[PDB]
Swiss-Prot record, chain A:
Role this protein plays: Catalytic component of the RPD3C(S) histone deacetylase complex responsible for the deacetylation of lysine residues on the N-terminal part of the core histones (H2A, H2B, H3 and H4). Histone deacetylation gives a tag for epigenetic repression and plays an important role in transcriptional regulation, cell cycle progression, DNA damage response, osmotic stress response and developmental events.
Other remarks on this protein: Present with 486 molecules/cell in log phase SD medium.
Localization in the cell: Nucleus
Subunit comment: Component of the RPD3C(S) complex composed of at least EAF3, RCO1, RPD3, SIN3, and UME1.
Species in which this protein is naturally found: Saccharomyces cerevisiae (strain ATCC 204508 / S288c)
Zinc finger map (PHD-type): 47-105
Name of this protein: Transcriptional regulatory protein RCO1
Swiss-Prot record, chain B:
Subunit text: Component of the RPD3C(S) complex composed of at least EAF3, RCO1, RPD3, SIN3, and UME1.
Protein name, UniProt field: Transcriptional regulatory protein RCO1
Miscellaneous comment: Present with 486 molecules/cell in log phase SD medium.
Biological role stated in the UniProt entry: Catalytic component of the RPD3C(S) histone deacetylase complex responsible for the deacetylation of lysine residues on the N-terminal part of the core histones (H2A, H2B, H3 and H4). Histone deacetylation gives a tag for epigenetic repression and plays an important role in transcriptional regulation, cell cycle progression, DNA damage response, osmotic stress response and developmental events.
Start-end of PHD-type zinc fingers: 1-46
Part of the intact protein present: 261 to 570 of 684
Signal peptide start and end residues: none
Gene encoding the protein: RCO1
Domain of life: Eukaryota
Location(s), subcellular: Nucleus
UniProtKB/Swiss-Prot annotation, chain C:
Cell compartments where the protein resides: Nucleus
Protein name per its UniProtKB record: Chromatin modification-related protein EAF3
Matching SUPFAM superfamilies: Chromo domain-like
InterPro entries the UniProt entry points to: Chromo-like_dom_sf, Chromo/chromo_shadow_dom, MRG, MRG_C_sf, MRG_dom, MSL3_chromo-like
Role this protein plays: Component of the NuA4 histone acetyltransferase complex which is involved in transcriptional activation of selected genes principally by acetylation of nucleosomal histone H4 and H2A. The NuA4 complex is also involved in DNA repair.
Residues annotated as domain MRG: 49-200
Family from the record: Belongs to the MRG family.
Organism encoding this protein: Saccharomyces cerevisiae (strain ATCC 204508 / S288c) (Baker's yeast)
Assembly and binders: Component of the NuA4 histone acetyltransferase complex composed of at least ACT1, ARP4, YAF9, VID21, SWC4, EAF3, EAF5, EAF6, EAF7, EPL1, ESA1, TRA1 and YNG2.
Additional remarks: Present with 1890 molecules/cell in log phase SD medium.
Length: 174, 126, 200
């Protein structure tokens, strides 16, 4: 709005309808009142199964305390309970709620240190250049994608498993 | 006249498309002359790809979906006909389904050989 | 994600955009973008590298020797590369290779076999050696069987083959660390053949 950086990490701002005059029970919060609509997705009408514990934990209206809060991931739409991952409430204002299962933007490997703030993706023009040649010992330092200048490779599950086993078979001696 | 694949003169041999001089007793393709027509491999890929079809599109891009047991060098296998052969020389300085099962079996065998080399190293360490 | 991702001509996809609901189709065929078919054909035409110096004497000795003898006089040669390639998985892979996967040796051996299966006719062919290969293909065509060179060719030309691969390695668009790994296992090969002088 004022000219700040806004990638896909940051969530869109909520409108005034969902934030001020969103009735009382709703109050832009599912921690209050029974909210069974958060456990049902409108895409298929099925039940949102959490990743850690395989229960939706909707509960019952006679026992509202047995209900467990769930949330939808903003990238892969993966359901997650609020008690499994350490988190108190929902994520509505600020960045998009990134579940702790994707690639982090910045990691730390103390040995001074390396940051590796990702590559934040390149559009589908000629700048995006692909070259799958080698599967073992590429040392491509990440920024990969899975298939069935900024150099990227068409890596698969087999190559990842091969270099993982190679590295932990060289590293188990130390 | 001459021979680009022989570095000599020899006899004279001509081609209908892209006429070049080569040895009559030694054909440019690996097929032995011991014919009705002769077509060179550079003449072949030219009349096949280099004329008007799939110039921008890489033919070798989808060549990996059916080829097995070679991964390190694959770009040089595509242009095996784009370069004419030559005689011996030396510089003076020196003077996927079945494929999925196949790679799964290869990884299984490599895991077992890793177990054997682990046994070998803990035997030789002690 | 993004703002332009469509298998057909893009219409700021994030279904045929800008059209009614009675035009959708979700059948499966080949997909090509082509930048909206060159922007509907410009709007209907505007509205109409070398080996190390360790054992380099072998090619010096064999360069003069192949002028009149060609290192072989028996067509059913008793020396085959199959056993010496099989012995790599039992002798050097179990000792020199770091504990893990032996893919970098076995897969390379299979690729070398595949390259040797069709490398004839284009390279490593002296003139009388070309005549010998011609007579081998002539005598092998009497039973309409494919020419398999694993039983009629020796391993002496394998050294010359690993001598002549690196300049055609860089002839194509290739990353440099792949060539570094290539020269690394070439160094491993010459390390293995440094003391095994009888077979070569």
């Amino acid at each position: 709005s004022r000219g700040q950086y806004s990638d896909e990490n940051d969530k869109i701002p909520l409108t005034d309808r969902q934030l001020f005059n969103t009735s009382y029970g709703q109050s832009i919060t599912k921690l209050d009142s029974y909210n069974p609509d958060t456990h049902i997705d409108s895409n298929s009408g099925k039940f949102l199964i959490c990743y850690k514990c395989n229960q939706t934990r909707l509960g019952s209206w006679s026992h509202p305390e047995n209900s467990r809060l769930i949330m939808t991931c903003d990238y892969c739409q993966t359901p997650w309970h609020l008690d499994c991952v350490p988190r108190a409430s929902f994520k509505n204002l600020g960045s998009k709620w990134k579940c702790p299962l994707h690639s982090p933007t910045k990691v730390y490997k103390k040995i001074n240190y390396k940051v590796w703030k990702k590559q934040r993706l390149i559009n589908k023009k000629n700048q995006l250049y692909y070259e799958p040649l080698q599967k073992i010992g590429y040392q491509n330092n990440g920024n990969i994608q899975i298939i069935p200048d900024f150099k990227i490779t068409q890596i698969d599950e087999n190559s990842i498993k091969y270099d993982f086993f190679d590295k932990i078979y060289k590293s188990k001696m130390v | 006249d001459f021979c680009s694949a022989c570095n000599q003169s020899g006899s004279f041999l001509c081609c209908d498309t892209c006429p070049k001089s080569f040895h009559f007793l030694c054909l440019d393709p690996p097929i032995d002359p011991n014919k009705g027509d002769w077509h060179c491999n550079e003449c072949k890929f030219k009349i096949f790809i280099n004329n008007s079809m799939a110039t921008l599109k890489k033919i070798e891009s989808n060549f990996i979906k059916q080829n097995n047991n070679v991964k390190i060098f694959a770009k040089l296998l595509f242009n095996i006909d784009s370069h004419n052969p030559k005689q011996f020389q030396l510089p003076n300085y020196i003077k996927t389904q079945i494929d999925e099962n196949s790679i799964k079996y290869d990884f299984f065998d490599k895991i077992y050989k890793s177990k054997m080399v682990q046994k070998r190293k803990l035997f030789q360490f002690q | 994600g993004g703002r332009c991702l469509a298998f057909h001509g893009p219409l700021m996809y994030e279904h045929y955009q800008g059209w009614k609901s009675s035009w959708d189709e979700w059948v499966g065929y080949d997909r090509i973008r082509a930048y909206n078919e060159e922007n509907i054909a410009m709007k209907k035409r505007l509205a109409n590298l070398q080996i190390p110096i360790k054992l380099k004497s072998v090619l010096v000795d064999d360069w003069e020797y192949v002028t009149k003898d060609k290192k072989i006089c028996r067509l059913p040669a008793d020396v085959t590369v199959e056993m010496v390639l099989n012995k790599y998985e039992h002798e050097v892979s179990q000792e020199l290779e770091s504990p893990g996967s032996q893919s970098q040796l076995s897969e390379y051996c299979a690729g070398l076999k595949l390259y040797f299966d069709k490398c004839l006719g284009n390279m490593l062919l002296y003139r009388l050696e070309r005549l010998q290969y011609d007579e081998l293909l002539k005598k092998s065509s009497k039973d309409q069987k494919p020419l398999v060179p694993i039983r009629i060719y020796g391993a002496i030309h394998l050294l010359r083959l690993i001598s002549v691969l690196p300049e055609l390695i860089s002839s194509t668009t290739m990353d440099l660390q792949s060539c570094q790994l290539l020269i690394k296992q070439t160094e491993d090969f010459l390390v293995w053949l440094l003391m095994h002088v009888d077979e070569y």
